Design a protein around this ligand. Structure first.
Ligand SMILES: [Mg+2]
Ligand SMILES: [Mg+2]
Ligand SMILES: [Mg+2]
Ligand SMILES: [Mg+2]
Ligand SMILES: [Mg+2]
Ligand SMILES: [Mg+2]
Ligand SMILES: [Mg+2]
Ligand SMILES: [Mg+2]
Ligand SMILES: [Mg+2]
Ligand SMILES: [Mg+2]
Ligand SMILES: [Mg+2]
Ligand SMILES: [Mg+2]
Ligand SMILES: [Mg+2]
Ligand SMILES: [Mg+2]
Ligand SMILES: [Mg+2]
Ligand SMILES: [Mg+2]
Ligand SMILES: [Mg+2]
Ligand SMILES: [Mg+2]
Ligand SMILES: [Mg+2]
Ligand SMILES: [Mg+2]
Ligand SMILES: [Mg+2]
Ligand SMILES: [Mg+2]
Ligand SMILES: [Mg+2]
Ligand SMILES: [Mg+2]
Ligand SMILES: [Mg+2]
Ligand SMILES: [Mg+2]
Ligand SMILES: [Mg+2]
Ligand SMILES: [Mg+2]
Ligand SMILES: [Mg+2]
Ligand SMILES: [Mg+2]
Ligand SMILES: [Mg+2]
Ligand SMILES: [Mg+2]
Ligand SMILES: [Mg+2]
Ligand SMILES: [Mg+2]
Ligand SMILES: [Mg+2]
Ligand SMILES: [Mg+2]
Ligand SMILES: [Mg+2]
Ligand SMILES: [Mg+2]
Ligand SMILES: [Mg+2]
Ligand SMILES: [Mg+2]
Ligand SMILES: [Mg+2]
Ligand SMILES: [Mg+2]
Ligand SMILES: [Mg+2]
Ligand SMILES: [Mg+2]
Ligand SMILES: [Mg+2]
Ligand SMILES: [Mg+2]
Ligand SMILES: [Mg+2]
Ligand SMILES: [Mg+2]
Ligand SMILES: [Mg+2]
Ligand SMILES: [Mg+2]
Ligand SMILES: [Mg+2]
Ligand SMILES: [Mg+2]
Ligand SMILES: [Mg+2]
Ligand SMILES: [Mg+2]
Ligand SMILES: [Mg+2]
Ligand SMILES: [Mg+2]
Ligand SMILES: [Mg+2]
Ligand SMILES: [Mg+2]
Ligand SMILES: [Mg+2]
Ligand SMILES: [Mg+2]
Ligand SMILES: [Mg+2]
Ligand SMILES: [Mg+2]
Ligand SMILES: [Mg+2]
Ligand SMILES: [Mg+2]
Ligand SMILES: [Mg+2]
Ligand SMILES: [Mg+2]
Ligand SMILES: [Mg+2]
Ligand SMILES: [Mg+2]
Ligand SMILES: [Mg+2]
Ligand SMILES: [Mg+2]
Ligand SMILES: [Mg+2]
Ligand SMILES: [Mg+2]
Ligand SMILES: [Mg+2]
Ligand SMILES: [Mg+2]
Ligand SMILES: [Mg+2]
Ligand SMILES: [Mg+2]
Ligand SMILES: [Mg+2]
Ligand SMILES: [Mg+2]
Ligand SMILES: [Mg+2]
Ligand SMILES: [Mg+2]
Ligand SMILES: [Mg+2]
Ligand SMILES: [Mg+2]
Ligand SMILES: [Mg+2]
Ligand SMILES: [Mg+2]
Ligand SMILES: [Mg+2]
Ligand SMILES: [Mg+2]
Ligand SMILES: [Mg+2]
Ligand SMILES: [Mg+2]
Lengths: 200, 61, 96, 85
RNA sequence: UUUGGAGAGUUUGAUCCUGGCUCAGGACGAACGCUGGCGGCGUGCUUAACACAUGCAAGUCGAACGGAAAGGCCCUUUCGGGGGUACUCGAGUGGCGAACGGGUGAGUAACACGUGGGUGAUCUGCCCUGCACUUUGGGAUAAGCCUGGGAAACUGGGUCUAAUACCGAAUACACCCUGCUGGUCGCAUGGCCUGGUAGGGGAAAGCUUUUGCGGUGUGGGAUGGGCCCGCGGCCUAUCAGCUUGUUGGUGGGGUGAUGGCCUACCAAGGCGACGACGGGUAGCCGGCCUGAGAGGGUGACCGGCCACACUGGGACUGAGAUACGGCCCAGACUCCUACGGGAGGCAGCAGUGGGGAAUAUUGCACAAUGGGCGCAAGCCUGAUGCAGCGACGCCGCGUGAGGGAUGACGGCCUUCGGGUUGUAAACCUCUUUCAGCACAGACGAAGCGCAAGUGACGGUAUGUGCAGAAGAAGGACCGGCCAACUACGUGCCAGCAGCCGCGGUAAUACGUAGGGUCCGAGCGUUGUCCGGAAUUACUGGGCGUAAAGAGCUCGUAGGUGGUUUGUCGCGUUGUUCGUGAAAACUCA
């Protein structure tokens, strides 16, 4: 199941922008609640939980399968933090969101659930696809005729496509080439506290 | 062994089949068990809507 | 007469049949002396691989395969090799 | 007994017990006579009884009532006792 | 040359130490409370090894034999049916199969179990493969007919018939035994060169005329098996001596095979403080949970073994008996009776009564594969493949999206200004996964048949269409630990509660409200187990007073050694091939 309640509540309580263009946040950064002014006592667990929640709702990932993320990252021989960030950025949802074919990660998930795309010529209608390397992601004719996808493809003029990701032309073919690196990704927050909380 | 009666109101009279769970109680020295509500003949006390699950109460309608 | 069995493991809705050469006296899942492969129809190709040399040694030593096992061996061409009539025929559809 | 197969098996087994008990009793009587001859202390009659008993022992063993190596065992043990006395 | 360690609270006026208790996590064959939509994939009596209504879960061969109850055919017919027909067949032998596969864990501390040898000490039908033979005579019984007892099961008496059912004899001279003579090996009697020698002994059965199968012994091998072997593998000395076939020798008997397996006589010993025998506990193991690790716990499923079949015993059948639905006897349980006597054994699949928290359906198929049968077709198989029930466990999906006010109600607080739920809501566009309704629609079957066809699952999985945001969200917590606060209502009551502790009128701790937090089709409680617990301290504790050095000595066993000169290398590591089942974990 996904989140059906308000989405701006998340940013308001979290104290940082999630989508990026929040007028309501900039109008009132204080987290909701009749006591959004009470001073918050320092707590290492508190901050670890804060970081965990922010990352989880930022990526739309469910709690259990993101624990699965963390354990899988431990399993891989590389460093746990960058392994986790790699495996969570590999999400087809994040791929479409950051390739300019989805305005928001939630909309990418909605479209994938609708099943309007072809991956390597095989129909797929699952959000959490594992986008390997060298792969190719397509979009099919009914998706093309769909209006909002057209708008997104002409609106992909935001923060430019990251290094390993790129779009080749009007058909919007997305292909990944090399290994994303933490420094170039510059995904926000620090994996230190996430790994600490899950190693608790 | 004695058992503790949760909630606020109860319908228990002598010779009433009941269900019991495990739990210590410090106020009562000779007590070490609770009695679940909403099972068998023990129902949850009416007028409860907060922590409804713990006491076995239905929703509003 | 030890016969070529198809050992079965796993769960209900997807049976597994490993190719085992064993005596029929034991359980259907009983003692497996030597394994040479497995067979599972759940997948549409239901790919099967056979070790020709081991199969032939067992046949020459006295293990009589069960009819489906022999048919599958003909399919893989091991029966053809053992008979020497057509030779060794390779037509197995390796999975796409 | 609740199946025709098992009941028929019990019939056949009783028949073959009648048969096998007969044969085994004959063999035991042969061995008993041989023993009596030996503790009496004769030589030629002992040898002739050895011959007859061995012939019938081999017949029974080939029939399958008793088993070959043990048949050889007691026949050779009896031969050893004879040669000892 | 690579993988991998969290603390917090609680003693005191206030510290520090030690130490005790509790919590933050994973996991359940888990149960209850609330909630609840689908699909995919597993899982599902842990207690009463309690008794069990019904039925299913073991059958195959006329080309072995006699026959014809029912059917097919033809001669006949008064329609009672009469002959043969072998297509076919009831039962009748004979076989083969039934020791399979399925179930359960009460006992069992044992060579019971994993691993490592084994046997010059055993067997083993059905399979293939080189290699002699299968002559001959005889008799009986079922079935059937008649009779009799008897409700009954069951039984007898008499006549009659055949054989892959039965036995004698023919041979064997390569096999099993015994009295005489060489070489090889040594790990020993002695084994192997079928070592040579003399004696005597021994087996079979036929079927089909077509991819033709049968019977008997043993140079080759395998499998299933038995025996015993080092090691090992709970707790209790508040269990210290136990044991008499017990311990060894010789001789006999016995076993498929040595051996107190059994018997007789000899000697008195054997086992015992590097824990005997005693007591309670409990199937062992590959494994499952935990832990960085060592280690701790534990034995769900699957799987390798063990033992059991209403309780106690015993034996037959054979290559194979603990013989689950094989036999006999004794007790219990239930039932039948015409009262003489009989039937029984769900822990086989399901199902019910009871216990309990609780574990589902009296479902379909041989479609595929294993398994039993046959020359095969072909038959049987709750093994199975599947289907229905159940949020119980891992995993994926749906109940919308985009924008939308210096932000519409209304609630709740207010310092009466206002904040607050809130991009939320209604609103304008969109896709509408999945459910709903239709079409197409697989493979799972180079598989079988000398036949034309063979799929339960399912008309499902899977694609394509139709109208519709339309059918879709709840649970726990919010005093500190512990990310989440305020007001309303009663105040040592009513109550909360994990530890500390919270109410004696103005509670962030009770209840109500809002608001917030965690989680989520699951959320909590409870209970078992690991952890932090270095809180049984090998890694890795302490002994002055916090708990501990006995009151102090000699000294047996055990434990331990002040030096160098010397070998064997049994303590040791050194490497090479040579075992470590599958399944599970780690890498791709
Ligand atoms: Mg940890
Ligand atoms: Mg079995
Ligand atoms: Mg295929
Ligand atoms: Mg067949
Ligand atoms: Mg019956
Ligand atoms: Mg007699
Ligand atoms: Mg006698
Ligand atoms: Mg015999
Ligand atoms: Mg002997
Ligand atoms: Mg002797
Ligand atoms: Mg690691
Ligand atoms: Mg304290
Ligand atoms: Mg103190
Ligand atoms: Mg203090
Ligand atoms: Mg329900
Ligand atoms: Mg399911
Ligand atoms: Mg299931
Ligand atoms: Mg038959
Ligand atoms: Mg017939
Ligand atoms: Mg048999
Ligand atoms: Mg049997
Ligand atoms: Mg059996
Ligand atoms: Mg089982
Ligand atoms: Mg059971
Ligand atoms: Mg048991
Ligand atoms: Mg013992
Ligand atoms: Mg062995
Ligand atoms: Mg056999
Ligand atoms: Mg003859
Ligand atoms: Mg007769
Ligand atoms: Mg005649
Ligand atoms: Mg003869
Ligand atoms: Mg002769
Ligand atoms: Mg001779
Ligand atoms: Mg010769
Ligand atoms: Mg014959
Ligand atoms: Mg050994
Ligand atoms: Mg050992
Ligand atoms: Mg002796
Ligand atoms: Mg001897
Ligand atoms: Mg002995
Ligand atoms: Mg003696
Ligand atoms: Mg046991
Ligand atoms: Mg282990
Ligand atoms: Mg550890
Ligand atoms: Mg450890
Ligand atoms: Mg264990
Ligand atoms: Mg198994
Ligand atoms: Mg097992
Ligand atoms: Mg074994
Ligand atoms: Mg028993
Ligand atoms: Mg038995
Ligand atoms: Mg049985
Ligand atoms: Mg029975
Ligand atoms: Mg029974
Ligand atoms: Mg059953
Ligand atoms: Mg009950
Ligand atoms: Mg019950
Ligand atoms: Mg079959
Ligand atoms: Mg035959
Ligand atoms: Mg044919
Ligand atoms: Mg049948
Ligand atoms: Mg049938
Ligand atoms: Mg099923
Ligand atoms: Mg269930
Ligand atoms: Mg439930
Ligand atoms: Mg899901
Ligand atoms: Mg919208
Ligand atoms: Mg097909
Ligand atoms: Mg085909
Ligand atoms: Mg589809
Ligand atoms: Mg469709
Ligand atoms: Mg609460
Ligand atoms: Mg907090
Ligand atoms: Mg707090
Ligand atoms: Mg008050
Ligand atoms: Mg409260
Ligand atoms: Mg809230
Ligand atoms: Mg623990
Ligand atoms: Mg210590
Ligand atoms: Mg002290
Ligand atoms: Mg002292
Ligand atoms: Mg003293
Ligand atoms: Mg060496
Ligand atoms: Mg070596
Ligand atoms: Mg090795
Ligand atoms: Mg393997
Ligand atoms: Mg692991």
């Amino acid at each position: 199941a996904r989140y059906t309640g308000p989405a701006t509540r998340k940013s308001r309580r979290l104290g940082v922008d999630l989508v990026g263009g929040d007028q309501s946040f900039e109008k009132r950064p204080y987290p909701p609640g009749q006591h959004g002014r009470a001073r918050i006592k320092e707590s290492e667990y508190r901050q670890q939980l804060q970081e965990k929640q922010k990352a989880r709702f930022s990526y739309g990932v469910m709690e259990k399968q993101f624990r699965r993320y963390y354990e899988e990252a431990n399993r891989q021989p590389g460093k746990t933090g960058d392994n986790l960030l790699r495996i969570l950025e590999s999400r087809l949802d994040n791929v479409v969101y950051r390739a300019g074919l989805a305005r928001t990660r939630r909309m990418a998930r909605q479209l994938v659930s609708h099943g309007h795309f072809l991956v390597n010529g095989v129909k797929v209608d699952i959000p959490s696809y594992r986008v390997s390397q060298y792969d190719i992601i397509d979009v099919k004719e009914k998706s093309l005729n769909t209006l909002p996808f057209q708008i997104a493809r002409e609106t992909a003029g935001e923060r430019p496509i990251p290094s390993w990701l790129q779009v080749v032309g009007e058909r919007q073919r997305i292909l990944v080439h090399q290994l994303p690196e933490r420094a170039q990704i510059d995904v926000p927050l620090t994996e230190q506290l996430i790994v600490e909380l899950y190693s608790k | 062994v004695t058992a503790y009666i949760p909630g606020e109101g109860h319908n228990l009279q002598e010779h009433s089949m009941v269900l019991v769970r495990g739990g210590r109680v410090k106020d009562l020295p000779g007590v070490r068990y609770k009695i679940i509500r909403g099972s068998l003949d023990t129902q949850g006390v009416k007028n409860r809507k907060q922590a409804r699950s713990r006491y076995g109460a239905k929703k509003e309608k | 007469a030890v016969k070529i069995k198809l050992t079965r493991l796993g769960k209900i809705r997807n049976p597994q049949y490993r190719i085992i050469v064993a005596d029929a006296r034991t359980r259907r899942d009983g003692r497996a002396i030597e394994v040479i492969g497995r067979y599972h129809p759940k997948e549409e190709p239901s790919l099967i691989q056979i070790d020709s040399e081991r199969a032939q040694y067992w046949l020459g030593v006295g293990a009589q395969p069960t009819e489906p096992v022999l048919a599958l061996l003909k399919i893989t061409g091991d029966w053809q090799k053992f008979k020497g009539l057509p030779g060794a025929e390779g037509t197995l559809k390796v999975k796409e | 007994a609740n199946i025709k197969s098992q009941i028929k098996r019990i019939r056949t087994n009783e028949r073959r017990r009648l048969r096998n008990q007969s044969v085994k009793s004959s063999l035991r009587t042969a061995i008993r006579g041989f023993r009596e001859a030996v503790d009496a202390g004769d030589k030629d009659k002992a040898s002739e009884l050895l011959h007859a008993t061995s012939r019938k022992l081999d017949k029974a063993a080939s029939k399958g009532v008793i088993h070959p190596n043990q048949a050889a065992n007691k026949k050779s043990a009896l031969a050893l006792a004879l040669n000892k006395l």
